[PDB]
Assembly symmetry: C3
Homo-oligomer: 150 residues x 3
């Protein structure tokens, strides 16, 4: 008699060669929010455990940021705070870092092609410590580029 | 210091499917594809029927056959599959008897025992990777109370 | 080689003086969805554990709502279900309530400038008490305003 409808939008970003997924099998979120503490004068970092999945485990995994990430006041371009990104214990930047199979622990993981868990950390700090940031809403993009080759 | 929290709700006063933990189901899910295993990680959540009448059957169908479609290329699609209460769902409705849904084992009036909801997808051809891109689709659940 | 770009938008709402974070450090969510049960005829309350982070732990904290929050039918603005908000064991309102420093347990927390944890509860009720709500999609905003007193 009564008809109830429920629409759930399903999405996927597919890469056939390489991707970085959460260690729990989920997709990484497209957006994260960092909290700033007026008490500790620091941001609470975003930390997530991830695994690289690849279609060839004989190749090297190369990781770099497409650009230097910044939190920028959405009302004032001039007002910025740097973002720091670490993955698998390595500070990432615009200069590429190479990760070899042994170091990614492919054999350890237990499914072929998939790395051991590595932590991804995204965080931020004010440009100069001691000086509190200016109030506002801030935005930026961590552009993670990862390549397979050799 | 202003802090804004948007709060929403979708209300059905006769029947709804909620999470088994009491939360609402999400309006959207994101599925991860692994280039290593060539498969998608399924979305799995335990659910309960909440209903104004627990003596009726619950009939469940999909309004349309769900697909993941390349946002930039309509011609490139992958099938989505949906399971509920241990049954593969389709455009043809499945009937769940009131007794099967375990209302008397739940211990809460009008709340069914838990039933797993599974959404997943697979490449069009098994063992062959799909093409790179961003894909999207709707699972359109239709549930009715029998008379 | 093959390159896969993955862009993660990072945002922050920065307040230098005072802010309310989740008790685990993360930012509060920007949105919550309340379930309505046709079985119990109630909305499930959203509850989250929170801490005040402040640059002065000696000051009273004043908390109010900017407007009386409503769950309003997105198709009909005249169908409003009242939203109720409590924080730290107090029902909040557009009329301010004050929380003394001593009461917020800054000195019981392990951390300078961080209060003891305080529960935030958001819930709602039907437009007319004792009568089920009409089917629809509803939306509203809980605007929380918090300043330091004396």
């Amino acid at each position: 008699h009564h008809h109830h409808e429920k629409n759930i939008t399903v999405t996927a970003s597919v890469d056939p060669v390489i991707d970085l997924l959460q260690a729990d099998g989920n997709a990484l979120p497209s957006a994260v929010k960092l909290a700033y503490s007026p008490a500790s004068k620091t941001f609470e970092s975003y930390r997530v455990m991830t695994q690289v999945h690849t279609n060839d485990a004989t190749k090297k995994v190369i990781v770099k940021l497409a650009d230097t990430p910044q939190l920028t006041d959405v009302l004032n371009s001039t007002v910025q705070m740097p973002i720091s990104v670490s993955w698998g214990g390595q500070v990432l930047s615009t200069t590429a870092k190479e990760f070899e199979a042994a170091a990614l622990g492919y054999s350890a993981s237990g499914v072929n092609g998939v790395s051991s868990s590595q932590e991804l950390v995204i965080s931020a700090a004010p440009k100069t410590a001691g000086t509190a940031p200016t109030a506002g809403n801030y935005s930026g993009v961590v552009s993670l580029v990862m390549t397979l080759g050799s």
